[PDB]
Design a protein around this nucleic acid. Sequence first.
DNA 1: CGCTAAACGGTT
DNA 2: AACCGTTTAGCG
Length: 66
Amino acid sequence: RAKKPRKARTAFSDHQLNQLERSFERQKYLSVQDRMDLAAALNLTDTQVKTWYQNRRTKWKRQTAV
DNA sequence: CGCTAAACGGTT
DNA sequence: AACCGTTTAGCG
């Protein structure tokens, strides 16, 4: 067990995942404002959205490479 | 296991 | 500060 507390793993709802994915198809990168807006719309934290987008870009790149 | 959320150390 | 590349880990 890590010495430093980690954050609990967020479980996204179906609506949140749908909306995150619709954002991603439109824009692969968000401005600060568009990110902080999407977080508010989905009742997520700014960092949860930032992280989701970052990890989603990793997945996107993996799949561009096949 | 596999998908992926969060963590690490480095990079822009 | 946001990102990258990659790792590490939660959990269905």
